[PDB]
Design a protein around this nucleic acid. Structure first.
Ligand SMILES: Nc1ncnc2c1ncn2[C@H]1CC[C@@H](COP(=O)(O)OP(=O)(O)OP(=O)(O)O)O1
Ligand SMILES: [Ca+2]
Length: 625
DNA sequence: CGGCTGTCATTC
DNA sequence: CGTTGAATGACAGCCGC
């Protein structure tokens, strides 16, 4: 029927409690809430290291101590020294978000997050939930959970459907279920040779990602609203530039209103459709296909961009600057990492614009460091290529790379016209796009499309590239055959993705899976290296500079009852590592970043790292030896 | 009426 | 039928009790 424990009886109860507690290695933790949403209103923590029994830590209802208990919890929760114990929670980053932000305890020890293990098993799985896990993992204990009906986030976040059961009940049941279960999961991971890869790599990723997600990132509405009115100007100005040719009752917003003049005065449609086809016109016809490019691009650049940023921005009182907070995601099929409150990964790239007298805009320039700071970006110069170079061992690429400076510049140099350089970056980026598209098996006719040429000509070009490098086709078809013999691919860490569709009869699921093996291995391992560089950098950053960790921890200083120095984790562009750093340590910071990104693990080629630096989000790069 | 599958914008 | 991969958000249809 019942077993739980309030840990308050005068003293002795609580005392033998911490006395046991301090000794234990593996243990589990969960909290709960009630109302009011940040929030500091949290009922109390709960802990269990095993068995049907569980311990609760309040904040019946007896008394002696007050601030005391919180101190004990602190002392218990961190790694004095040399004493290495681990701790588990359903999801992670937000529980640590609370412990730091709500009550001001910076938890530091070894960490184990089970939904991440569950994911590490099945990258294609959908977003594990409690009920799903205790179902798939802890059966004989399960039925009890069914008194509640919530599974998305933890039992604190499930506060509503739990509200009829809410209290210590939720924190405790989450604690114990999580403990037996995570014991089972860890059994499963060690049952493969993934455990070193789990505890000693990806949980640290969740960690680094977390103190980031606390860092947030800097923003200035003055810039946002500046380029805002810029864009409004080009909006209406292009409206009249358009209706100078005709105009007939027009507004761009409606595609059916567009059907009128488009289908009428021009007549070339190879609902109807819109975009690709009119780009096909943007090459050739001058009379306002590209007016539609600039207009449509503008609208996307405002409504799906300026609005949400100007919405869900917040401020740090501790800075005097406003910043915005993403969320750690992971759960990518490859193992790459994304962010959603907005996603600032896809934020628009700078582009030029017409009103000599030209102009240019950057939606992204509005991200600033703190007043004293500057932003450091460390980009991998063509990492995945190097990876494929390692696995195919194509010596030819190893040489074309170990020499070539942005080998895209060479590909461009021999392609649309011969120029040695003075290659515009719009072109450079188009080239990068076409090529990376090819490597994973771009379609022949579509290649003919992006370059603008005929089918068989483009196909003879692809065949030409198999001829140029066969180590690729070797590695390629071979790894396909392995995916049939096994049914999964494997990234270098030993993390592996299950491709079900590779064996399927339907030609499409089979084709898609063939390429999918390729991209999954290379992008997956790419993201792996990146994670490793992140945790390296941050772990060094941690003790090496004796100041402290990240922006949440200030707020932690106010609850635990100054100058600004360090550099802080901000973002990952998957090969790019994004830091803001005080303009002090920026050189030290830079050489550390270069160092740990190049020092992840050694392989067939050296990984050059271009490192850009400067005020705001648009920038310059140089450093010397 | 909510899961499910797809076009259509942007990234890397 | 659907032949670059990984993403995020909208939006629109389709089932199917
Ligand atoms: N269109 C695409 N399709 C597939 N994979 C792609 C891709 N674009 C990028 N990747 C993968 C493979 C590369 C990786 C990051 O590519 P960057 O855009 O950062 O360009 P990088 O190659 O690093 O050259 P740099 O510009 O840095 O000099 O993401
Ligand atoms: Ca790059």
């Amino acid at each position: 029927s019942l077993s739980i424990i309030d840990v308050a009886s005068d003293q002795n109860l609580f005392q033998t409690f911490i006395k046991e507690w301090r000794c234990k290695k593996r243990f589990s933790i969960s909290l709960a809430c009630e109302k009011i949403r940040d929030d500091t209103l949290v009922v109390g923590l709960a802990v269990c290291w095993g068995g049907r029994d569980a311990y609760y830590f309040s904040l019946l209802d007896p008394s002696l101590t007050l601030k005391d208990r919180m101190w004990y919890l602190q002392s218990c929760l961190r790694k004095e020294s040399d004493k290495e114990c681990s701790v588990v929670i359903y999801d992670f980053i937000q529980s640590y978000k609370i412990l730091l932000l709500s009550c001001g305890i910076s938890l530091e020890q070894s960490y184990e997050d089970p939904k991440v293990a569950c994911w590490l098993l099945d990258p294609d799985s959908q977003e594990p939930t409690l009920h799903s896990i205790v179902t798939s993992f802890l059966p004989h204990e399960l039925p009890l959970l069914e008194g509640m009906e919530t599974s998305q986030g933890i039992q604190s976040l499930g506060l509503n459907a739990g509200s009829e059961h809410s209290g210590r009940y939720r924190a405790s049941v989450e604690s114990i279920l999580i403990f037996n279960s995570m014991n089972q999961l860890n059994s499963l991971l060690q049952k493969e040779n993934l455990q070193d890869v789990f505890r000693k790599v990806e949980m640290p990723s969740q960690y680094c990602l977390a103190l980031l997600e606390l860092n947030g990132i800097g923003f200035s509405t003055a810039e946002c609203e500046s380029q805002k009115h810029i864009m409004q100007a080009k909006l209406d100005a292009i409206e009249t530039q358009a209706y100078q040719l005709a105009g007939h009752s027009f507004s761009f917003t409606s595609s059916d209103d567009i059907a009128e003049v488009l289908f009428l005065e021009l007549k070339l449609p190879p609902q109807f459709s819109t975009s690709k086809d009119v780009l096909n016109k943007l090459k050739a016809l001058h009379p306002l296909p590209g007016l539609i490019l600039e207009w449509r691009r503008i609208t996307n650049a405002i409504t799906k961009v300026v609005f949400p940023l100007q919405r869900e921005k917040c401020l740090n009182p501790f800075l005097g600057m406003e910043r915005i907070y993403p969320v750690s995601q992971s759960h990518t099929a490859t193992g790459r990492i994304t962010f959603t409150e907005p996603n600032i990964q896809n934020v628009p790239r700078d582009f030029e614009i017409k009103m000599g007298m030209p102009f240019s805009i950057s939606m992204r320039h509005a991200f600033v460091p703190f007043p004293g700071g500057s932003i450091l970006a460390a980009d991998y110069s063509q990492l995945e290529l190097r990876i494929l170079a390692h696995l195919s061992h194509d010596r030819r690429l190893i040489q074309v790379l170990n020499t070539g400076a942005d080998v895209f510049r060479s590909i461009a140099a021999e392609w649309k016209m011969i120029e040695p350089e003075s290659v515009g970056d719009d072109l450079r980026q188009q080239a990068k796009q076409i090529c990376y598209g090819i490597i994973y098996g771009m379609g022949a006719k579509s290649l003919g499309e992006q370059m603008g040429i005929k089918e068989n000509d483009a196909a003879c070009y692809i065949d030409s590239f198999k001829s140029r490098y066969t180590g690729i086709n070797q590695f390629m078809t071979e790894t396909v055959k392995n995916c049939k013999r096994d049914g999964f691919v494997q990234t270098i860490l030993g993390r592996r993705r299950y491709l079900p569709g590779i064996k399927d009869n339907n030609p499409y699921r089979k084709a898609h899976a063939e390429r999918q093996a390729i991209n999954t291995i290379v992008q997956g391992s790419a993201a792996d290296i990146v994670k490793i560089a992140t945790v390296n950098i941050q772990k060094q950053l941690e003790t090496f500079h004796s100041t402290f960790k990240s922006h949440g921890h200030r707020e932690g200083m106010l609850q635990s009852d100054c100058p600004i120095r360090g550099g802080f984790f901000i973002l990952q562009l998957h090969d790019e590592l994004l830091y803001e750093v005080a303009e002090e340590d920026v050189v030290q910071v830079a050489q550390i970043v270069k160092n740990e990104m190049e020092s992840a693990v050694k392989l067939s080629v050296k990984l050059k790292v271009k490192v850009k630096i400067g005020a705001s989000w648009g920038e310059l790069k140089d450093f010397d030896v």
